[PDB]
Structure formats: structure tokens, C-alpha cells
Amino acid sequence: EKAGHQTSAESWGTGRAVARIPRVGGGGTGRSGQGAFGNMCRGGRMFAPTKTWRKWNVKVNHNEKRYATASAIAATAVASLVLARGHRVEKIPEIPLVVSTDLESIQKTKEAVAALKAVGAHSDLLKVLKSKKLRAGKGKYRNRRWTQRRGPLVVYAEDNGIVKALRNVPGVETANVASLNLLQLAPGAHLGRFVIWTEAAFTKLDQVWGSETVASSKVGYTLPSHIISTSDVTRIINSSEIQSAIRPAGQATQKRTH
Amino acid sequence: AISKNLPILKNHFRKHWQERVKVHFDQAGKKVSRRNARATRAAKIAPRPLDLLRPVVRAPTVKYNRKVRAGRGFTLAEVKAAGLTAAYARTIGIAVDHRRQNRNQEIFDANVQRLKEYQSKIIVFPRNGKAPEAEQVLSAAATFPIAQPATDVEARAVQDNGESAFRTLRLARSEKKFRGIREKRAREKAEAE
Amino acid sequence: AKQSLDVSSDRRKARKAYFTAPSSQRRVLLSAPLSKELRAQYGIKALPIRRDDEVLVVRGSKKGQEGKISSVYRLKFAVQVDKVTKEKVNGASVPINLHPSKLVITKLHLDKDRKALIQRKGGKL
RNA sequence: GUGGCCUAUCGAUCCUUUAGUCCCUCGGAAUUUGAGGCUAGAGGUGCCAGAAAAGUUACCACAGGGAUAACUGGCUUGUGG
RNA sequence: UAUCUAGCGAAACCACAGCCAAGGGAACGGGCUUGGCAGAAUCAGCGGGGAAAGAAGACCCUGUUGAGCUUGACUCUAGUU
RNA sequence: UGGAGGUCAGUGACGAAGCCUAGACCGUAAGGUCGGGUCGAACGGCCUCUAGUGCAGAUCUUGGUGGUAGUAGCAAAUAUUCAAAUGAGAACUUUGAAGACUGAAGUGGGGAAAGGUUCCACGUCAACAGCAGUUGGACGUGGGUUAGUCGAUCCUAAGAGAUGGGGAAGCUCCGUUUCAAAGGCCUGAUUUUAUGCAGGCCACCAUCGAAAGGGAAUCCGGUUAAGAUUCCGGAACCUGGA
RNA sequence: CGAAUUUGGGUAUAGGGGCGAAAGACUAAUCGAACCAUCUAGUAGCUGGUUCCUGCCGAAGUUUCCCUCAGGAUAGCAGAA
RNA sequence: GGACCAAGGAGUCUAACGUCUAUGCGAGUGUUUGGGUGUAAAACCCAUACGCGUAAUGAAAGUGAACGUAGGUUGGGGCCUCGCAAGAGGUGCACAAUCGACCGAUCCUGAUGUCUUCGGAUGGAUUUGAGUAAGAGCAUAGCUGUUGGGACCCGAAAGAU
RNA sequence: UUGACCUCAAAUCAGGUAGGAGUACCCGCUGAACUUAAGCAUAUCAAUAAGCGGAGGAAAAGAAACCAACCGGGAUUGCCUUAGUAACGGCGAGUGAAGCGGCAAAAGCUCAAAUUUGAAAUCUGGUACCUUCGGUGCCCGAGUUGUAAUUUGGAGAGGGCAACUUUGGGGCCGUUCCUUGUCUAUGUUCCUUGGAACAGGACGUCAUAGAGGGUGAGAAUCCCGUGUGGCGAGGAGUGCGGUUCUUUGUAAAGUGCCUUCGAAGAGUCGAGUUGUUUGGGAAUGCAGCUCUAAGUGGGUGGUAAAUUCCAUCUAAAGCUAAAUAUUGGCGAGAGACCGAUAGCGAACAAGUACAGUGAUGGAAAGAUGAAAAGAACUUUGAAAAGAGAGUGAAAAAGUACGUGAAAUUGUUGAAAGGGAAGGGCAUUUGAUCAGACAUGGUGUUUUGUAUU
């Protein structure tokens, strides 16, 4: 708050053939007689100095947060969204990828890597490993020296060495079904995170988020309803129930007359 | 200045408010420090429930008259009816409040019952024993919760006798308003023969 | 990744600690790895380098150059090895520094303290 | 016939003061006084949509103004010639 | 002294620049219009012009900008009674 | 444009970023892409986030640089000249010779304030001496200041200022002998016993304040590159001590 | 130009104060109220500046009130949704 | 104003808000003061409260929103019934105009009763309200606009300590 | 002729203590104006800045002379809220709390006023002894104008019954924080580029370690570390389990019945007035002056004045952790921050150099290279230096050093030029330069003979 103001500068006024900016008084320095206090001035205070009471955190409604989390989880099961997000799942039989609780009980990093290789997430591992690069700016000397891709998110229900076994494996993240962060479920606000569920995590999803026959255990919460019954608007448009009332069409393009 | 159709706002920022700005950046760190302090005090008093047993009291005003909440400490009358001295209650973890009186039998019974429950549910170690610890719990408040007394049943019988409960309110307000004038009239009529 | 809160992964702090380390810490910083033969003999992966250790270069323009250490210039963060020099144009031979991390220790200068440190780190002579 | 034959002859907030219900409040119930409210007038701002207000500076200062005076120049030519 | 030479060597100023006549134009042009014209590089003088330079006119007005001084201005005050 | 989250398993020491280029293409443009030189360690496309985000001006700020311009100028204080030496080099250094000047309220010989080593010796062009420089109060390295008698120190002047006291919320203010219980030199004591004691006089009424006021006392000759009323030789004086 | 003389050193007087044989003079090149730091990035209806491109739309200097006349509110004119 | 060139250089952030828009939920809404937990400022999870909204009006004591298919009339998109292309009928949400009804305030007339001075039924009135009349809000974010803040950047003469 | 008391002195008497610093936060005093009101005087700014006094790790406040008006809460302090509200305000500009409610933290209390009077039972100091933050002999002193025990308003005070917990004290192994120390994994294997491999490729290894840094370029595996555990060079020791010498064998605490009571703070409450202050309004707090109390008294109950009744506390004496604050100090971890005209004034011998008599003012200034390998030697010059040579990956890195941009210059080259230059349209001239002619189709006299 005192940067640029540790000076006793006063304006010289008019009549001295110099600008009316405040000037440092005294002599025999070279700093004396120099402009001060202003944003245009060298050593002066910046314009509108940054303050700490700027709004840093942003409030989001609990329901909107849970809506986004549910959308991200549902995007994890869309095969095309995961490809678009770029997760090297072209050699996985099907997604959502559900594995046994032996993975929950896994202990060593080498055997966690073996599990990933046997299941099909090793290509994502190699992508993370080979994408490591130096940052492209002044972020290197701000403790952000390297950047790499995001690997699979291993979601478990119980922690029996799963976290520590995957802790050193690069790019892999591990999460509990109870938390299931949106910052890990849609990094960069991009849907379709590659997720490896344990069987217990997959089973507990229905308790955590509710169903048509089960409540969410998030009190007062139920999953959002789509605004449209199906996304297959092409199928609806081309259904017989509509085409029957539809009047006959043109040529998909008009012949140039005159 | 003043301008188009807008509310008149009173933003009290004509002093040097920028010196007195307290933005709570330490919310997370202070929550961590509070949890750490609670854990450290629990380790210090390792067998003890981390807090004192508070009584049930009524909230004072007419707006919170309905609610029943946790007070500061039990009355000397309450701890006497439970069967303890004030000093021993304080020493074995019962909050004692000297200045609070009980003009209310219902609250008296509720707090005496709370005291009996606490006495039954705690164990006092001897001063020269083997200290048979019992997996300390951390909240006397959580294990002796304050429950709102049930005032009435869900269903009852309609007992109508024809006063409408609005004429009653109007009349009671009228008697309150005019009692002094009525007493005036009575005293004047007694005085003037 | 780090887990403890007294470990700092800040580049500025780590660099300052390195460059302003005293000589006692520079001794540990200037540790050198033993050869394969010496590692098999002792059971020690690396040791803080000393003045009379016989050392072999395994990296740089003097790869495969043998020589006994002539000094451990902790101020310059380097070691000076005999017969690893540069002949200036005037004919004077000047020492050429090199980091002990680019060396391999091929013969240890053993005294009571070196042997005790070997047993401490897990060696058996 | 709801003042003057018509077209002028006049006055906010705040405060005071009067008139009216003797109507509401003084917040722990009130004899009662006092005070505060409700509605209509009056006490006044003539700079009349309403600040509470003496000069001097040739010792002077600042922000400005060619929105504005003291030269020239420009239009005019009453006046002068 | 200026002047020429050896050495040494600044500054004020500078939109771009540098020939006129008239016209019109912010009513006195180096530029624009129409004419006159118009030949490298320059030296010493000079004081007509550059409405030359020096200074956000000190005169004048405006500002709900001051300050020094005065008083039967408004509002107070130290002392004193 | 700087940063941030994702992604291109993007570009790169076989050359990133920057910079130069009357070379090319694209876009109406903001601008983007590439060719060729320079180089040396990081950088970019895309979807989003974010802001200390874009300059021709503000008599803008800070640096740098021009034309003016090899121009104004380097003209007060009478004035310099010949030879030799040294030197790479001499109008300016040194030494001779001449001509002069200050002309004893000096351009002489000392000091006060101030400066602080400029004093003195030894080495040459980088800077400085508004020309030059072999010279210098410059640069580098060294040496140099000797007191009983000269000063300070002591005294008091105008004055400043503690204490005792009294103000003031207080920092502090007044006051300087005031409404105060305000201290110091000789023999007896000076050894079975100390500075304890009828041993005496008593009553300056802090202190600071002058290198020109007052005041105890040193002169001559010689000596150094540079100190001398200080060193040496000779000859004296003052103060304090049985 | 022998004194109301000139001057060294010491000392006193400090800012709404001092000091003045009196000029608003002098008080460290500062005086019709010194200098230093801070309040203070004081306020300014006033002057100056206000940084990329293209596309579409596109004014007002008028009304009423204002210590109002270099300013504002209001209505109008304009854009966007 | 600008001799020149480089770099720097001027509508910012915050508190409280207006219109609009997007989103979530919706007669409700807002987790984040706190508590639990955590892969140690992130997640993630947890309300009795509190804010705003769901009732107005009056200075206040206080009183407090269906005479009806939540009314009548005009106009209304859409939908329904329609003959071979007119155009007729019906129902008509939103919204606009109008006449009413209800709640509060003001001015009135005052019934059975009676702490004979109280309660105020009933009927009204060119009066009046930011009201009712099958809720629309709460929260977050964004542009723009507002006010207080250095407040787009530079600029006094002054004033204080 | 003597011995005391009271008060007041003296001593280089014995032993202590205070001052000053720092001051971010804390407790007070004192105290403005700029500013806003579009002027301005009350107001605002602001009970702020400057000035002064005084502490600590926090300070302060704190166990009601409280809030309330309720079915009543119950020390203090903070947060959310109350609430931009009630109120204050030329009722203008503006200002503006508190109760309740949720939560964080929670903790309680002790003096005066009582005769121990069958025993001043209390305490500093001097001198001895010892287990020395002290404990015991003795002596003097203080003290009755009152030092101990006893009671503090919640209460508490010359006694007696019917079963009735405890004790308490200096040590030792150890629960517990650090100066902290030490030990604990895995390639430097082959090829390419390079001066250097830390870069590309192949093969691997460890991983509860792929954080970060160093090393001649982007290094988990070369080094330090990092992750997980293990073992230790010391200090602080009722939030305690067992030992340790043992209970100073009349040691201090409650009701089913009260023989009496029940001391409770004075120039102080309170009233007036004055000034200041508060949202506090016929006056919120504070202070000066005047008057000046009382015991079912006194205060309050947010509009000034007898009361049939209330309600609620108990002042004028005192201590007390935690939640709370913290632009200072010490230690540590971070950042969508800045990146050498930026960020602190200061990345550097920076509060330095220099400017002022002084108070004060206060810069500029980072980068050779991996390594000085900082250029031996030869030649010209008086010398600086040049030209060769040399080191280097590079000297287009030579200390005036990473690339070195623009303004501004020198040289060469090319062009125009009769009192500006520059610009637009259009062409011409000279320079310079990009755009199918290997091809989704036909086919052939072999260029050097999956076809050319």
C-alpha cells in the first residue's frame, strides 16, 4: 500500500517549463527533481493498485454444483466424449470401466501399474508420461515448472492401499465415490474424464446419487430431469407420427429462376 | 450526484474504511487450527467429554418463546434436587449457574431428568484406581441432546362453545386498555358518597 | 511427491539453500557414487567425496580419465583431480574442475571416520 | 351564490403556534400534569421551487477564459474628414 | 574583439519546414487557389519577417478558488471586568 | 498481450524465444503464416478462465539521441622572448639569459574560521587542470606534525543550566538561592581500639560558558625532503613535593 | 570616512513567532507569514491527455427547476434488449 | 501540445444496488458464521437459525384480503365444432381498457348487549394505499448504469499537525 | 544524671527496583484540518492523522448495581444476524448502535466490613545447617492505628445425630515439544546429435520415492533429497501408570431437625450546572464546580414530574485462561502476483553514494563462457593499441563481454534533387519475385536395364 508513495514529492507548479507532475525535492542525487507519485511515472504508484479484498472465491449453488457433477459423471460413460477429451481408451472393451475390489486392496505401485496395463489405461499412462513439457512462460519460476496431461481417475469406495499404490503413477488420480469432485470429473471444464470404477464404487453410486427407486442420501436432493425426453431429435422428426402430418417438402435447394 | 429512477442507497464509506478492512483469508486455516485445538485438548483431557453438560432453558422473548435451547448451567436448586453439591457437580463436569432461577416446574423436571441421565451415563474414576477407561466420547451435548417438549397430540376432539377467540382477544385488549379508567371511576364513585 | 509440511518444494528456496549452504553441507552436496566394483565390495551406493579418493570420470569431455583427488573446492562446488588439467597457451597447467556427481569413486581414502561412516551407512569392508 | 365582472395581487422542508377529535403514544400496569403524533390554518423566505453573511488589495495568489474588456487587424460609417 | 587558422567546444530553440503578390480563409499564409517565378555548395554582416525565443497573461472577466489587511459584516475567542 | 485449467502423447540445442530483411502468401483490417540472415533454451495452435491487456500526443515519466554545430565561444587582472636539457612528443616542465610586474593596507612573511594531508619524496599517460603538458593542489606508493615554558586545560562575561521546590495529562516548563536539616583542612586521636571522638575555624551558597578577555614559567644558535619558542647544543625560568 | 562608525568571536530572540531608525523590510539565493515531514493520491462545476480493427444504428446545443448563467437534474433527441 | 526514439503511461477494485440476460431450484430459496471430513486454503457432506420472498395498510393503537365458476364488459393468441375455396359458433391463458367486489387508512350511520361507557354488528361515502382478486421468488454469474470510496490519469492558490 | 514513642532526616549503610528500546496489534490522554455539504458557520471528515503516557504474547473485558417484560435468559470476548434498522441529523449532507436468535470458546472466583483473645497463631531480613526457583535452629525487626486461619451474598457465621470419599509432599522409569542427529530404493547399459546428453531411439529397474534442487541443455532411476519406517549426542517434567520414605494416628469438607443472626465499599450514589461525547432523543458516557444521602436502602426499567403495585440486579474494592487482534520480532509453507524503468527506495559494499547548517532528502547499478581455457608467441607503434597467431562450440562471447532494437551516425552500393519533403489514382522504366507443366487421364524410337 505504500509502494510509490515513500516520497515527499511536491508539484513545482507552472512557470518552470516542466510538466505539473509532483517532483522529488532536494539535490545532489539524480533522483531529485524527478517525477513521482503517478502511474505514468517511473517509480510511481501503479494505477488502481491491486487490493486483497478483491473477490477471490466464487459462490455456486449446491444444486448447480451437484448438477454439474452428475453431468460430468454421466459424460464419463459416453464413449465419444472421453475420446474428444483425449483419453486413449481406444483399446478398452467398453466404458464405464468397472473393475474388482482387488484393485481397492492393491498395495504396490508396480502392481497398480500392472492392473492399469491389464485393464487398458496404460495408453493413458503413456500419454501423461510423454506429454511432460516445460511451461511456456513466467510460470516456471512460480513453482509451476512442468505441465502434463491428466490420466485416468480411479474411483474407489474403500481405501486399502489403492491411493498409495496409484500415488506415484503419473497422471492417475484417485477419488472416493463420496466426494467425486467436478474439478477431477471435468478438467478444464471439458466433459468425459476417463474413469475406472471399482465394483463397490459403481454399486455405491446409486446410493450416493439416488435413482428412480432410491433416495440420494443427499437430503432434499434428487437427480435433474432432462428438458427433452430424448436427444434423438432426428429420430423424432423422421418418425411416422410426425411425417404423416407433415406437408410435402421442396428440393433441399432452390433452382435459380430468372 | 442524483440521477434516474434508482433506490436511495446509504453506503457508509466516507471514513478511512480501507485501513479497517478484514477479509477472512484465514477461514480454512482457522478451521484447521480450531480442529487441531479441539483434538489437542481432547488428548490433554483424554478421558473427558471435551465439554460440560448444559441444561435446557427457554428462550426469553415472545419471538423465541416457543423454542427451548441450551443454557449456561444448572440451577443450585436443580443440582440439589438431582442430589449433588454445586462444587462436586462442577468438578465432575456439570455446568452450574448460580444466577439462573427456576420459576417453572416443567423446566425444573426437564433439567433434573437431564442431571439424572448424565449421572447414570457417566463413570467417575477413583483417585487411586486402575483407571478403567471407557472409550471417551467427545460431546456431552451430542450424547444428551436438547429435545423440544411435545405440547399436544396430533389429533383431538373439537371443543367449540361459541366465543370465536377473536371477541375474546378484543375484550381482553379492551379491559387492559380501560382498566385504569375503570378504577378511576370506581374510586371517584366511592369517594363522592 | 512430498507429504511432510517441513519439506519445501519451492524453487527459489531450494536454490538459495544450495547456493548459500555452508562448507559442512557442501560436503554432503558434493557426494560421489562408488564404482560398480566398490559398490559390490562395500555395499554403499555413494559417499561424500574426500581429498585423497581415487576417482574416474564417467561423464564429460574427460570420460574414462582416472586420477586421485587433489582438492575438494567446496566454494566452487567442484573437485580438482591430478592429471586432469588444461595446458594454457603459455605452458602453465591449470586444474579443471568437475562435479563429483559426474565421477565414480574407484578407491576410497579410508580412516577411522570413513570406515565408521561405511558401517553406519551399512557397509562391511 | 364555494369572495370581488374576467384577465395580476403571492410562498416549501425543518421549527414554532393555533383549531379539531379530546382520537393514538410515552414501550413494567397509570390519578394526573408535561411531551410526542394525526388533519387544517398562521408566523417566510420579493434572489419570490425558498443561504444565515461587510469591505479592501497599487503586496498579492491559483484554476481557467479570447465564452469577455484594455492594441492592431476585420464588418459598419452614426460621428469625423 | 569580431575575422582566418591549431586545439577545445556548449546552449536557447525545433509539428514539418523555410521566395513572393493577391484571393479566400478563425476577417494579417511558408503551405491552400490564381499568378509571379524557379539552378548545386556557400562566407561575412544584418536586424524586415518567422504575428522569432524567454513565462499554463501579473491587466480584465469568470470560479459558489484563495490569501494579506480593515471594519458599525456574520459567528466566536484569549485576556480583562 | 501477460498469466491460468484442458488438449494437441504440439514445435525445439539436427536450433525455442527475441531481433534484422524496398522477399512471399493470406485477411477489408486489427493482424496471421512463411523464406533468408543473427543467436542459444525455451515456445506455440485450439476450447475455455483471468487481467497491472494494445499509445502519437498528456509543456506525460525515465533513459538514450539529434539538427543547431565544428557553430557561440575559450578577448578583464600591462608580457613575454632566446638557448640548453629532459622527453616519442615542449608556446606552457627544468635550468640559465633578457624583458617585466606586484611596489611593504604587496602578487612578500605569518596566522584566525574553514579545509583535512592539499605538506614532502619517488614513477608515466587513463581521466582532471574548458589549448597542451614530460608539469600539478591529479594518479599510485610511501614519509611527515616531538612542548613543564606556545595553546587548550583553570577563571569568570553576556548567557546556558541540574538540584530544592512549584506547574503541566505529558513530552516537559519555570526557577538558580529561591517558603531546602544543602560542606570542607591541621594536630591530639595515628594500634591490648578506629579514621571512631566534649579536638578548632567556620559558612564558597552546583556546573557549563572565551584556542581574541583574565592567566605561572624559554631564549639564542644549529639541525629536516618535509617538524620545531617542541628535536640537538648551550644558557634559564615557573609550579608542586620531608 | 573618528563616529547614531566598521568589524571578528561568543550570546539572546523562532514562524501568526522573532526582529524592524519602518522598506511588509529581514528571518540560510525562500517572506503580505520561512523551511522539513506528515494529514495528502487534499478538492477542483476548470485545462490537458485518455492506447486495436471492422460492421450496423446514430444525435444535441431545446423545455422546466436550480446562488441557476463554463455546471447539474428533468423532458426531448439516440442505442440496445 | 508536439526536435527525435525506446520502455512505462490513464474507467480499476470493493460495499450496497437498478434494468436486462443465462442458470439452479421454486412457495420457497441461499452448504461454505460454523460443524464433519479431506488426497492439510481444494474437494465433498451437514440446519434448529438468519436474510429475502410468501400481506397489506396506518403516524400509531391496531385491523387485516372470495356476495359470484376469484365477478361483469370490450379486445384477445392458441385450441374445439365446422360446409369443396366464405367465414359462423364455442372456449378463451398472457396482456391492455373499463365497471365492480374484498383488505387497510380517512369521514360517516351507529344493532343485539352492557364494568352506561364500553364493545362496533349493519349500512355507506365525487376520499385514500407502494394492496387482494389460483403466489414468483431466492441464489449465483455476465454486460451496462448508480452512489460512497484516491475512483479514468496528471494538475492548484490553500488548511492542519 | 536516663530510657521510650511520633514525625522528619543522613549515610559510597544491606539488598533491590525504575528509567531507555521497539511499538504491527493492545490500554488511555490529547487532538486537527484538508474533505463533504456542489457556498458555509452546526454537522462531516473523526471521537481519525499528528503529539503524549503505559503493557503483553496477546492486551483489554470478565463472573451483573446485566439483559429483559418472557413459559424469561444468565461472566467476558469474537463471528453471522439484528441492520443501514430503532434513533441522531441546517431532520440537509450524512450518521447509527443494542436486546433476542445461531455459533466459536467456555471457568471460576476473593478482599473490606466479625474477638483466635486459653495465648500474632503472620511476615521481611541477619547469622548457621541442608535435598538451594527453596527448607529447617536461633536472633533482630515489622506488626495490635491489625499480620494469619475463618465468610464474600450463589451465601455464610459459640453445636449436636443413625450406615458415610479423600489425604498430602522433594525423586526414578516413562504419556508428551524440539536445538535436533543418523540410517534406509532404482541405469549413469548400447546407437545418434552435441563442446557438454541432462536431448532423440532400444532395452531395463525402483516406486508408500515420477516434490524440488544441483550437475557442462527438458535427469524418478548421477548427486542431494523425496516416500516409508528404524535407531540416537540433550533440554521442559501433576493434562499421569508403577516404584519412592511414609502418613506430622485430636490434620480439612455435606443433610431428614434450627437456640440467633446475617457486618456487604461516602465528597460515594444522587441532584443541579458547564464542557465534551454518544444513535441515546426535557440530556448516553466522561470530566470540572456546587449541593450532597440512605437503609426492605440503592441503581436500572431509553419522554420530564407524588404513587395502590411491579420486575430486575446489588455500585462507589479486587483477580481470572480460551475463543479475538497482530503492515513489529523469530521460524516455516505457499501464490492464476512482479520480473531489473517491474517488484520494497534497495535482486548489487542500499538507507549505501551524494545534497542540505539542520529537520530531512535519497538514486543509479543484475547476465562473458560449461570451464578463464581472460588471448603464450611474432610484428608495427613511444605507448594506448593494431595486425597476425592462440583458447573456445561460438571472440557475430575479449572483461568497454548473453542476442545486442530504435532514434542517431560512418562506409559502400542504388537512385532522384530549378525556393521543401512526404502522400492518392493511373501507367511507364529499372530492379526484384510468387504462381500447371513430377500429377485422380491417355500410354512407349529402353534416360544410366515393386517395370524406365
From Swiss-Prot, chain A:
| GO terms under biological process | cytoplasmic translation
Q: Subunit structure, briefly?
A: Component of the large ribosomal subunit (LSU). Mature yeast ribosomes consist of a small (40S) and a large (60S) subunit. The 40S small subunit contains 1 molecule of ribosomal RNA (18S rRNA) and 33 different proteins (encoded by 57 genes). The large 60S subunit contains 3 rRNA molecules (25S, 5.8S and 5S rRNA) and 46 different proteins (encoded by 81 genes). uL4 is associated with the polypeptide exit tunnel. uL4 interacts with its chaperone ACL4 and the nuclear import receptor KAP104.
Cite any additional comment in the entry: There are 2 genes for uL4 in yeast.
Q: Where in the cell is it found?
A: Cytoplasm; Nucleus
For this UniProt record, give its keywords in alphabetical order, as a comma-separated list: Acetylation, Cytoplasm, Methylation, Nucleus, Ribonucleoprotein, Ribosomal protein, RNA-binding
Query: Is this entry keyworded Metal-binding?
Result: no
Q: How is it modified after translation?
A: N-terminally acetylated by acetyltransferase NatA.
> Per UniProt, what does mutating residue 242 to A do?
Leads to an inefficient release from ACL4 with a delayed assembly into the 60S subunit
- Give the protein family: Belongs to the universal ribosomal protein uL4 family.
Annotated Gene Ontology MF terms?
RNA binding; structural constituent of ribosome
Q: Does the keyword Glycosyltransferase apply?
A: no
Please give the function described in this protein's UniProt entry: Component of the ribosome, a large ribonucleoprotein complex responsible for the synthesis of proteins in the cell. The small ribosomal subunit (SSU) binds messenger RNAs (mRNAs) and translates the encoded message by selecting cognate aminoacyl-transfer RNA (tRNA) molecules. The large subunit (LSU) contains the ribosomal catalytic site termed the peptidyl transferase center (PTC), which catalyzes the formation of peptide bonds, thereby polymerizing the amino acids delivered by tRNAs into a polypeptide chain.
Q: Name one GO cellular component term.
A: cytosol
The protein's name: Large ribosomal subunit protein uL4A
**Domain of life of the source:** Eukaryota
* Spans through the membrane: none
From Swiss-Prot, chain B:
- What are the alphabetically sorted keywords of the record? Cytoplasm, Phosphoprotein, Ribonucleoprotein, Ribosomal protein
Q: Which GO terms describe its molecular function?
A: RNA binding; structural constituent of ribosome
The cellular component terms of Gene Ontology attached to this UniProt record, alphabetical and capped at eight, are:
cytosol; cytosolic large ribosomal subunit
Classification via InterPro entries: Ribosomal_eL13, Ribosomal_eL13_CS
> Could you tell me which residues carry Phosphothreonine?
143, 151
| Pfam annotation, one family | Ribosomal_L13e
* Predominant location category: cytoplasm
Cystine crosslinks:
none
Cellular compartments annotated: Cytoplasm
Q: Which PROSITE patterns match?
A: RIBOSOMAL_L13E (PS01104)
The record's Gene Ontology biological-process terms are:
cytoplasmic translation
What is the purpose of this protein?
Answer: Component of the ribosome, a large ribonucleoprotein complex responsible for the synthesis of proteins in the cell. The small ribosomal subunit (SSU) binds messenger RNAs (mRNAs) and translates the encoded message by selecting cognate aminoacyl-transfer RNA (tRNA) molecules. The large subunit (LSU) contains the ribosomal catalytic site termed the peptidyl transferase center (PTC), which catalyzes the formation of peptide bonds, thereby polymerizing the amino acids delivered by tRNAs into a polypeptide chain.
By sequence similarity, the record places it as follows: Belongs to the eukaryotic ribosomal protein eL13 family.
Miscellaneous comment as given in the Swiss-Prot or TrEMBL entry = Present with 133000 molecules/cell in log phase SD medium.
Q: How does it assemble?
A: Component of the large ribosomal subunit (LSU). Mature yeast ribosomes consist of a small (40S) and a large (60S) subunit. The 40S small subunit contains 1 molecule of ribosomal RNA (18S rRNA) and 33 different proteins (encoded by 57 genes). The large 60S subunit contains 3 rRNA molecules (25S, 5.8S and 5S rRNA) and 46 different proteins (encoded by 81 genes).
Q: What is this protein called?
A: Large ribosomal subunit protein eL13A
Name the gene behind this protein: RPL13A
UniProtKB/Swiss-Prot annotation, chain C:
Q: Which residues form a coiled coil?
A: none
**Where would you say this protein principally sits, based on its record?**
cytoplasm
Q: Which GO terms describe its biological process?
A: cytoplasmic translation; ribosomal large subunit biogenesis
Keywords assigned by UniProt? Cytoplasm, Ribonucleoprotein, Ribosomal protein
Task: Fetch the InterPro entries from UniProt.
Answer: KOW (IPR005824), Rib_uL2_dom2 (IPR014722), Ribosomal_uL24_CS (IPR005825), Ribosomal_uL24_euk/arc (IPR005756), Ribosomal_uL24_KOW (IPR041988), Translation_prot_SH3-like_sf (IPR008991)
GO CC terms on record? Answer: cytosol; cytosolic large ribosomal subunit
Q: Where in the cell is it found?
A: Cytoplasm
Keyword Cytoplasm belongs to the record = yes
Q: Name one Pfam family in it.
A: Ribosomal_L26
Keyword Isomerase (UniProt): no
The protein's assembly and partners: Component of the large ribosomal subunit (LSU). Mature yeast ribosomes consist of a small (40S) and a large (60S) subunit. The 40S small subunit contains 1 molecule of ribosomal RNA (18S rRNA) and 33 different proteins (encoded by 57 genes). The large 60S subunit contains 3 rRNA molecules (25S, 5.8S and 5S rRNA) and 46 different proteins (encoded by 81 genes).
| NCBIfam families assigned to the protein according to its UniProt record, in alphabetical order | rplX_A_E (TIGR01080)
Q: Which PANTHER family match?
A: 60S RIBOSOMAL PROTEIN L26 FAMILY MEMBER
What this protein is reported to do is described as: Component of the ribosome, a large ribonucleoprotein complex responsible for the synthesis of proteins in the cell. The small ribosomal subunit (SSU) binds messenger RNAs (mRNAs) and translates the encoded message by selecting cognate aminoacyl-transfer RNA (tRNA) molecules. The large subunit (LSU) contains the ribosomal catalytic site termed the peptidyl transferase center (PTC), which catalyzes the formation of peptide bonds, thereby polymerizing the amino acids delivered by tRNAs into a polypeptide chain.
Q: What else is known?
A: There are 2 genes for uL24 in yeast.
Can you name this protein?
Large ribosomal subunit protein uL24A
Q: Encoded by which gene? A: RPL26A
